[PDB]
Structure 1
Amino acid sequence: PLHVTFVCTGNICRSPMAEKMFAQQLRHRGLGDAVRVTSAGTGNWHVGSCADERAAGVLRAHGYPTDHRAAQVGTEHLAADLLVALDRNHARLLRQLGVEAARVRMLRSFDPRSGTHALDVEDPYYGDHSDFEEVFAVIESALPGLHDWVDERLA
């Protein structure tokens, strides 16, 4: 059972959205039981909390699940086959956490339009609904490449 996890700071906005969106797609693709998808944060001040409301609101609006319980990065996540970081600071930390460079990758690097220098997924925490809608757009735009990665592994 392949294991892919998404990582941001608080695990209440960006990472949780990626997790659910990806999970959903995997389900549509009949790959539900082949891949395990989670998300965790580098910080510990939101641990156990539900996903940010504005985040849930956008997921809901697009028909995605919103059930979520924030977790801090732990042994569980550090053991995933692929750690996907939302921005480059998350990437730096997972790296300092012991994960080898190759198992750590930024979400946008999977965007089919991405260049060599991956882009951060801007944090929408200090904005409103539209900002999360934007983040959804950015994430949706990146996931396809993550699917290519999964397909390859499952083969």
Structure 2
Amino acid sequence: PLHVTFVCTGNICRSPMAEKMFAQQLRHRGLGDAVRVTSAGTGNWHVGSCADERAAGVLRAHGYPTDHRAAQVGTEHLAADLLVALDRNHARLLRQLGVEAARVRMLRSFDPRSGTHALDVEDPYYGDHSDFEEVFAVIESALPGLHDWVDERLAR
């Protein structure tokens, strides 16, 4: 089973949002059994915690699932077929951890409007509900390219 994992720092806002969203989208496409989707954080200050109440709030506001258990990047995640970094800091950490460039890609590099320079997804933790809605929109705009990536991989 193909494995894609999203990575941010605390695994309570950005990455879990991308995880639930992409996983649900795959289910709608009937590809839920063929692709495993998870997420983790580079840090461990939230291991075991649910997603941020505001993150679950926006997910729910758009009809997506919210169940989540925060975790720090481990063996399981580093063994994914693709590690999706939320921002450039996450990417350099995963890179420096030993993951080759081809397996570390920033989420926004999948946005159809993306240029060679991939943009960061901002952390909404210290913002307001508006910031969480914006993070949702940014992620929503980037995922279509990840679906193409999955289609290419499943062909294998």
Q: TM-score range by the shorter chain?
A: over 0.9
Q: Any idea what the Cα deviations from partners look like across 1:100-151, whole Å, max 9, x if unmatched?
A: 1110000000000000000000111101111100000000000000000000
Distance in 2, Cα, partners of 1:31 & 1:103: 21
TM superposition outliers: structure 1 runs of 4+ over 2 Å = none
Distance in 1, Cα, partners of 2:16 & 2:74: 16
Q: Any idea what the Cα deviations from partners look like across 1:7-64, whole Å, max 9, x if unmatched?
A: 0000000000000000000000000100000000000000010000100000011111
Say which SS state the counterpart of residue 47 (structure 1) adopts. Answer: coil
Distance in 1, Cα, partners of 2:128 & 2:66: 18
TM-score, with structure 1 as normaliser: 0.99
Q: Which runs of 5+ in 2 are unaligned?
A: none
User: What displacement does 1:98 show?
Assistant: 1.0
Distance in 2, Cα, partners of 1:97 & 1:70: 20
User: What displacement does 1:97 show?
Assistant: 1.1
Q: Any idea what the Cα deviations from partners look like across 1:51-106, whole Å, max 9, x if unmatched?
A: 00100000011111000000000000000000000000000000111101110000
Say which SS state the counterpart of residue 154 (structure 1) adopts. Answer: helix
Say which SS state the counterpart of residue 145 (structure 2) adopts. Answer: helix
- Corresponding residue for 2:92? 92
Say which SS state the counterpart of residue 84 (structure 1) adopts. Answer: strand
Say which SS state the counterpart of residue 116 (structure 2) adopts. Answer: coil
Identity of aligned residues (%): 100
TM-score, with structure 2 as normaliser: 0.99
Say which SS state the counterpart of residue 39 (structure 2) adopts. Answer: strand
- Corresponding residue for 1:132? 132
Distance in 1, Cα, partners of 2:37 & 2:128: 27
Q: Which runs of 5+ in 1 are unaligned?
A: none
